[PDB]
Ligand binder design. Structure first.
Ligand SMILES: CO[C@H](COS(=O)(=O)O)C(=O)N[C@@H](C(=O)N1[C@H](C(=O)NCCC2=CCN(C(=N)N)C2)C[C@@H]2C[C@H](O)[C@@H](O)C[C@@H]21)[C@H](Cl)C(C)C
Ligand code: NA
Lengths: 27, 10, 249
């Protein structure tokens, strides 16, 4: 589907203020 | 203190 | 949400508010998983020890929301429910095992900048992401403190906790249909879901495909944000056969 891609974020290639924290956590 | 929503939604 | 922050606009376009018609009030959170299907905790809809047993006509869903209280004209959409489905083996008697329910909407919601479904994990994404140490994100408009209402949607990122720690943190019998998340007492960082956040999504962002997956649903916990306690979540992948079953109809 088009699931899990946010119009205001992934779709525009903008990052939210804390998603990086989650990526970081994948050691 | 929720603002009233439109009546069309019941 | 306890010890979280205001969400950004559109940060969580799958966030759904279950809204009570009668005293117009927030009941729970929920998530949008297609144009016609919303996911929530069973105990939001059905809890006999307290006489709670909702019918479709009692509730509305509000999708695209940011502000808790205000009607968000031209942004949010409010839908009626066609049908409620509770997991047949939801255990309200004991420990809220399989705390999950689906709501079918009367009409497909129209997607927008503020309204968009979340992904449900496949076995592989689950196996790779659902690991102790790895962080997800929980959102809702529930309590800011255990004993206090936010003006807007709150967000917190939390690490998944090892099963032995989860089990040792609580008197409740924990099952494989649950996982817990939150910082350990000394780790220094805080945060938890709380009453009102119930039924909201615990999501993770895939490093493989950049998509957000819903892995958990806000279920229960001993208080909110206590040291050596953790929030407990319905394990969505473990219950996905049932999810798919219902959607095939
Ligand atoms: C909020 O905590 C109070 C008190 O904790 S206690 O250990 O000191 O009694 C509580 O009732 N928690 C109970 C409870 O969670 N719950 C569930 C609940 O309210 N869920 C809301 C979401 C949430 C609440 C706390 N969370 C969190 N991440 N920290 C998540 C419903 C469940 C059923 C009743 O609606 C009532 O007995 C409260 C129970 C659990 Cl099962 C406890 C008895 C083991
Ligand atoms: Na906690």
């Amino acid at each position: 589907a088009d699931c899990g891609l946010r119009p205001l974020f992934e779709k525009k290639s903008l990052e939210d203020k804390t998603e990086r924290e989650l990526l970081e956590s994948y050691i | 203190d929720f603002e009233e929503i439109p009546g069309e939604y019941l | 949400i306890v010890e979280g922050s205001d969400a950004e606009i559109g940060m969580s376009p799958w966030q759904v508010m279950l809204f009570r018609k009668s005293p117009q009030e927030l009941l729970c959170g929920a998530s949008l998983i297609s144009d016609r299907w919303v996911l929530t905790a069973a105990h939001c809809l059905l809890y006999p020890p307290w006489d709670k047993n909702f019918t479709e006509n009692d509730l509305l869903v509000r999708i695209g929301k940011h502000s808790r209280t205000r009607y968000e004209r031209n942004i949010e959409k409010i839908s009626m429910l066609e049908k409620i489905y509770i997991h047949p083996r939801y255990n309200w008697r004991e420990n809220l095992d399989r705390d999950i329910a689906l709501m079918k909407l009367k009409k497909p919601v129209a997607f927008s900048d503020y309204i968009h479904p979340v992904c449900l994990p496949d076995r592989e994404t689950a196996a790779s992401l659902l690991q102790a140490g790895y962080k997800g994100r929980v959102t809702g408009w529930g309590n800011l403190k255990e004993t206090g209402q936010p003006s807007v949607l709150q967000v917190v990122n939390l690490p998944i906790v090892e099963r032995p720690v989860c089990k040792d943190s609580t008197r409740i019998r924990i099952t494989d249909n649950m996982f817990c998340a939150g910082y350990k007492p000394d780790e220094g960082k805080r945060g938890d879901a709380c009453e009102g956040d119930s039924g909201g999504p615990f999501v993770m962002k895939s490093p493989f495909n950049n998509r957000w997956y819903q892995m958990g649903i806000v279920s229960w916990g001993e208080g909110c944000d206590r040291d050596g306690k953790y929030g407990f979540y319905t394990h969505v992948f473990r219950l996905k056969k049932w999810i798919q079953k219902v959607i095939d109809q």
